[PDB]
């Protein structure tokens, strides 16, 4: 298995802490505010769209749901 479909994907992450986008590119949200992670943006950043807003998302201020992206073969 592990085929995956590169087309329609969305990961819901929770804001571990209140963040404030420095520029239009970055986004803002208060701890607890969920954000849709369109697709990886950088080593420590992502791409999502807030309420009427669109920009990047901090991977440090956000905690991915059970099953983070590791892509590391192995089981048991």
Curated annotation (Swiss-Prot):
Q: Which domain of life is it from?
A: Eukaryota
Domain SH3 per the UniProt entry, residue ranges: 8-67
Q: Where in the cell is it found?
A: Cytoplasm
Which tissues is it found in, per the record?
Predominantly in hematopoietic cells (spleen, thymus and leukocytes); low levels in placenta, lung and various fetal tissues.
> Span of the secretion signal?
none
Quaternary context: Interacts with NCKAP1L.
Tell me, in a sentence or two, what this protein's role is. Inhibitory effect on stress fiber organization. May down-regulate Rho-like GTPase in hematopoietic cells.
Spell out the protein name for this chain: Rho GTPase-activating protein 4
Tell me what organism the protein belongs to: Homo sapiens (Human)
Please tell me where this chain falls within the complete protein, as first and last residue plus total length: 746 to 814 of 946
């Amino acid at each position: 298995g592990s085929s995956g479909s590169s087309g329609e994907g969305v990961v819901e992450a929770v804001a571990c802490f209140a963040y404030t986008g420095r520029t239009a590119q970055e986004l803002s949200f208060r701890r607890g505010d969920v954000l849709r992670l369109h697709e990886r943006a950088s080593s420590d950043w992502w791409r999502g769209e807030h309420n009427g807003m669109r920009g990047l998302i901090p991977h440090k201020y956000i905690t991915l749901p059970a099953g983070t992206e590791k892509q590391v073969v192995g089981a048991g």
